[PDB]
């Protein structure tokens, strides 16, 4: 049986504040700029539509040097940091971005038509953009976040997959890495392996995987380390209703309609797809720049940062403004020429993480050691190399950032005022 | 006279948790894919616009094997499960679908016209799609849900129905089965038997019956077994205003207008129909992923699951995103060709049902046995074959899912915290 950490984790009266200075990220909104011949990334892809997964490193409270150490017995017990307060500061002005594709697979406008559309020739793709669905979310836990998305499932050993055959789906659980993309209105799927077309969605998600937090799975998690607190806010509506060019993969059963004739003799593509639109963004609806007091967790792990680690996942599309900056090739002619100017796109993100940590102690009795050993043997081994080297996240080092004077920091003042004593 | 179950049903102190692992449904959004020459369903129709009716099977508390059995007398009484908490977990990202018809009966745009429209020829149908009305609802009871819809009533034995005569309407009560369609903006009616046209609405409801819960009838129900708790949330607005091609079934009385001339000599179709649109979808408006505490029922049956059965009806169109996946017939040519790619459509639904059940006992006195006998004779007969074999629902077996450790589950923790003791 699993038990609340409140059972075996003792709470001291010591609190420390820790915060990143001010994280900054600048890059191209849709794709990374690199040397054609090369593969080294010159400019990275930075979009408001990517997940930001911060791997927070905390100083080992056992190796740490406290002014007083009488508060615990280093022989019978050990120390762990407990996250009690978080403030995800965001810094750019609110605004909405926009993504498209020069060759988006969009046949005709099916929202309203005055006459039957012509006939699909070869490549009827259009240059089209859209404002993605709005999403604000924040996940906190001592284990990285887990997402779900539809990918191409493995086929059954029978009927040989005829070329062009529809690929099988499979919900795939994955680890959400820093830089991954969020569902933008086309659901959470792997567009690379499910769309040979390469033109069904805008460039920025076009050959990526849009993942959605698997909240269900994470909360079911027995120990609940992956996430002990979260805030989600997503909204979306249909801006336009389109058709997909291409060829019928699956025909419309004729028992569903009466054959036409002349123009209506041939059925138009009924492979409709809508254009998303996350409406207006607003201050009143902000999730960030507000402190989160992680006092009672719904999981058994009540904010204990086992391994002196801490994960903070964030997605904020309420500051997705992309800025176009163009340089002139010549500063002479007083006559505009498109060609005299090179147009570019850049997007900036501004973060500022702040935390309040509470020191905790664990008396290593038999039972406790058995439990903690079963739960996560590494805990004890590390007490008296990176297991997630495969994954990549925004590394954040706070080992030199802890301060006992909450007083001197904004999140600190807030915490004191909130907790009174 | 009917009486509250609180009268004859005794509440023990035992509580169990039970939950589905994670139900998953994948299919085509508008119609089932099957073998032409055949009739077996190769891929089912799975849409966010269908009702999901779960037939929950519970282990017989009488046959069940409890660690302690002193809490009751198996001679004078019997045991029944009472539903006290439900959590309908939903798992895909929020999003809106879209449905249309390649040959929708839409003459002209009547929202605004600059000149009198031409003249209906033969087949003026257009390839049109729309975003259905938004609907979120959850019905719970120990009897299947009941819906209403307009169908073709039986004609009076007199005036021989002239071909093309308008068919008579009749409100028809039916049992809502898993897979049935929800009103989408065109009301709750049987389009198959009321629209020979086969082109009045999108393919997905085109030859189906859109049913609406008959809340009034169900709550009027004397014992109130069909539904002892519900949540409904529906919204819709007019996106477009159209005209219907076809021939005047009923003419416009000439006392309602002044005859035209020339172009306005011939009256245009005044058989208008609007295009629905369930606006934006939002987190803040979610109904699911929240626990429902069924403590005080408005009906006489206060959540008693007679027959060790339990019905959970759901409709959620806030995750109706359909995803188009296309496979290339050839991976050679570096030039797009619509003929080289087969376009398809698929939609996925993700559920996770969780419940908290309270054990109950009934001392089988004379009066009690007379009452329960009148109410539903099968109760007693089953105590010391399926009556709804005709109907089909998502069968859910929980006989091996009960656990006394609410502590170990998210809904269980929530319940304890909520009920304190």
């Amino acid at each position, epitope marked *: 049986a699993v038990v609340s950490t409140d059972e075996y984790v003792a709470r001291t009266n010591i609190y420390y504040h820790a915060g990143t200075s001010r994280l900054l990220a600048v890059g191209h909104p849709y794709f990374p700029i690199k040397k054609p011949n090369n593969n080294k990334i010159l400019v990275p892809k930075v979009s408001g539509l990517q997940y930001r997964v911060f791997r927070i490193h905390l100083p080992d409270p056992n190796k740490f040097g406290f002014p007083d150490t009488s508060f615990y017995n280093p022989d019978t017990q050990r120390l762990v940091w407990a996250c009690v307060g978080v403030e995800v500061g965001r810094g750019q002005p609110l605004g909405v971005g926009i993504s498209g594709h020069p060759l988006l697979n969009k*046949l005709d406008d099916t929202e309203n038509a005055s006459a*039957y*559309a*012509a*006939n*699909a*020739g*070869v490549d009827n793709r259009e240059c089209i953009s859209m404002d993605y669905k709005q999403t604000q979310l924040c996940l906190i836990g001592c284990k990285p976040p887990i997402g779900e998305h539809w990918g191409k499932g493995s086929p059954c050993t029978q009927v*040989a997959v*005829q*070329p*062009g*055959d529809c690929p099988p789906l499979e919900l795939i659980n994955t680890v959400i890495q820093d830089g991954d993309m969020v569902d933008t209105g086309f659901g959470a799927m792997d567009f690379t392996t499910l769309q040979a077309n390469k033109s069904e969605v805008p460039l920025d998600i076009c050959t990526s995987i849009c993942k959605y937090p698997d909240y269900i799975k994470m909360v079911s998690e027995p120990y609940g380390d992956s996430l002990f607190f979260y805030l989600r806010r997503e909204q979306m509506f249909v801006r336009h209703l389109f058709n997909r*060019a291409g*060829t019928v993969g*699956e*025909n419309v059963p004729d028992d569903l309609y009466i*054959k*036409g*004739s*002349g*123009s*209506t*003799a*041939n*059925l*138009a*593509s009924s492979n409709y797809f809508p254009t998303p639109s996350g409406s207006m963004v607003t201050s009143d609806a902000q999730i960030f720049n507000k402190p989160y007091w992680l006092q009672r967790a719904q999981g058994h792990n009540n904010g204990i940062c086992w391994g002196n680690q801490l994960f903070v996942t964030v997605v904020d599309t309420t500051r997705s403004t992309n800025m176009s900056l163009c340089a002139a090739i010549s500063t002479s002619e007083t006559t505009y020429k498109n060609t005299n100017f090179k147009e570019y796109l850049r997007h900036g993100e501004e973060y500022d993480l702040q935390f309040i940590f509470q020191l905790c102690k664990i008396t290593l009795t038999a039972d406790v050691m058995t439990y903690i050993h079963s739960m996560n043997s590494t805990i004890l081994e590390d007490w008296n190399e990176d297991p997630l080297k495969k994954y990549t996240f925004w590394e954040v080092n706070l080992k030199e950032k802890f301060s006992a004077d909450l007083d001197q920091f904004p999140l600190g003042r807030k915490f004191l005022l909130q907790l009174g004593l | 006279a009917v009486v509250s179950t609180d009268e004859y049903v005794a509440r023990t102190n035992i509580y169990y948790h039970a939950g589905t692992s994670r139900l998953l449904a994948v299919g085509h959004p508008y119609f089932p*894919i099957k*073998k*032409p*020459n*055949n009739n077996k369903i190769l891929v089912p129709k799975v849409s966010g616009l269908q009702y999901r009716v779960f037939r929950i099977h519970l282990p017989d508390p009488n046959k069940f094997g409890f660690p302690d059995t002193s809490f009751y007398n198996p001679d004078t009484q019997r045991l029944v499960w009472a539903c006290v908490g439900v959590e309908v977990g939903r798992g895909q990202p929020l999003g809106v679908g879209i449905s249309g018809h390649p040959l929708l009966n839409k003459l002209d745009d009547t929202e605004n016209a600059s000149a009198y429209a031409a003249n209906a020829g*033969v*087949d003026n149908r257009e390839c049109i799609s729309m975003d259905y009305k938004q609907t979120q609802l959850c019905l719970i009871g120990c009897k299947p849900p009941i819906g209403e819809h307009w169908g073709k009533g039986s004609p009076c034995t007199q005036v021989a129905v002239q071909p093309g005569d308008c068919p008579p309407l009749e409100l028809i009560n039916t049992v809502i089965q898993d897979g049935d369609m929800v009103d989408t903006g065109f009301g709750a009616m049987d389009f198959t038997t009321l629209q020979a046209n086969k082109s009045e609405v999108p393919l997905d409801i085109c030859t189906s019956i859109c049913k609406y819960p008959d809340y009034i009838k169900m709550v009027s129900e004397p014992y109130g077994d069909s539904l002892f708790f519900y949540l409904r949330r529906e919204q819709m607005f007019v996106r477009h205003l159209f005209n219907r091609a076809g021939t005047v079934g009923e003419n416009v009385p000439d006392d309602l207008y002044i005859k035209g001339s020339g172009s306005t000599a011939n009256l245009a179709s005044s058989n208008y129909f609007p295009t629905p649109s369930g606006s934006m979808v939002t987190s803040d408006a979610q109904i699911f992923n929240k626990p429902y505490w069924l403590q005080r029922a408005q009906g006489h049956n206060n959540g008693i699951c007679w027959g060790n059965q339990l019905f959970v009806t759901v409709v959620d169109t806030t995750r109706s995103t359909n995803m188009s996946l296309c496979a290339a*017939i*050839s991976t050679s040519e570096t030039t797009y060709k*619509n*003929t*080289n790619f*087969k376009e398809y459509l698929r939609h996925g639904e993700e559920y996770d049902l969780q419940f908290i059940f309270q054990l109950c006992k009934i001392t089988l006195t004379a009066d009690v046995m007379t009452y329960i006998h009148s109410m539903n004779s099968t109760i007693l007969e089953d105590w010391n074959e399926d009556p709804l074999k005709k109907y089909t629902f998502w069968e859910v077996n929980l006989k091996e899912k009960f656990s006394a450790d609410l502590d170990q589950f998210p809904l269980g923790r929530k319940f304890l915290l909520q009920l304190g003791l």
Partner: antibody, heavy 118, light 108 residues
Framework: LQQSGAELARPGASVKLSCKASGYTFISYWMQWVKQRPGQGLEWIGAIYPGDGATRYTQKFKGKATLTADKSSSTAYMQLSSLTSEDSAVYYC???????????????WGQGTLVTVS | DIVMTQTPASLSASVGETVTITCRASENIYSYLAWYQQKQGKSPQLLVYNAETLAEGVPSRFSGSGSGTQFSLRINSLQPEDFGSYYCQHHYVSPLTFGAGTKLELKR
């Protein structure tokens, strides 16, 4: 669309005609079957969509012609039964280019198979 | 079934001459008409589809016209390679049916 040159059949029997597709994505198109007797014009028999087996038949040939396909070999087949002298004719398979309702042409025809009932 | 009436059954003409072959439907077929040429001893080849659109490799001297029930195929300034048989066929719905055919022969 390679078709065998000729078939000799006995009266009352059946005949299986083949059509081998090559040079294109077979599963993306229907297959047309057309009859030609020297005296008369062209007559449509039916058409099939190999991707799911959907067929359409001339009422005249319902109960006479069966259409099928072998997606692994890209071959379309037509079978006729109860053959009489009236079935002796040249049978062609052909394709139907369909891209949209306004772009389509059944323009490529096989060489035909001369079926002689004798 | 839908009937396509094609006329004339036979037509003589000289090189350089403009001729017209017509096809009339028993009921409305909209714009979904096709035309084919069949030379002596050869398989048919499609010239026109959707009543008026030129097919792959068809000289612009050919032109289809019409919509509803009356259609025509006109050949401007006949060339030697244009003599042979022509057939109309609707491709609106099944069953697909053909016109009777026109044999275009060279005057001498």
């Amino acid at each position: 669309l390679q078709q065998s040159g000729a078939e000799l059949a006995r009266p009352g029997a059946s005949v299986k005609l083949s059509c081998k597709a090559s040079g294109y994505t077979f599963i993306s198109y229907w297959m047309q079957w057309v009859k030609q007797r020297p005296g008369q014009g062209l007559e449509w028999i039916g058409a099939i969509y190999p991707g799911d087996g959907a067929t359409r038949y001339t009422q005249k040939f319902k109960g006479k012609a069966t259409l099928t396909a072998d997606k692994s070999s890209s071959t379309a087949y037509m079978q006729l039964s109860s053959l009489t002298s009236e079935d002796s004719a040249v049978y062609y398979c052909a394709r139907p280019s369909y891209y949209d309702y306004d772009v389509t042409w059944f323009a490529y025809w096989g060489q035909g198979t001369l079926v002689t009932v004798s | 079934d839908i009937v396509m009436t094609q006329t004339p059954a036979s037509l003589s003409a000289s090189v350089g001459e403009t001729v017209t072959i017509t096809c009339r439907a028993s009921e409305n077929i909209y714009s979904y008409l096709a035309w084919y040429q069949q030379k002596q001893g050869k398989s048919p080849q499609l010239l026109v589809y959707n009543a008026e659109t030129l097919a792959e490799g068809v000289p612009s001297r050919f032109s289809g016209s019409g919509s509803g029930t009356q259609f025509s195929l006109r050949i401007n300034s006949l060339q030697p390679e244009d003599f042979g048989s022509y057939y109309c066929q609707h491709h609106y719905v099944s069953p697909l049916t053909f016109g009777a055919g026109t044999k275009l022969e060279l005057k001498r």
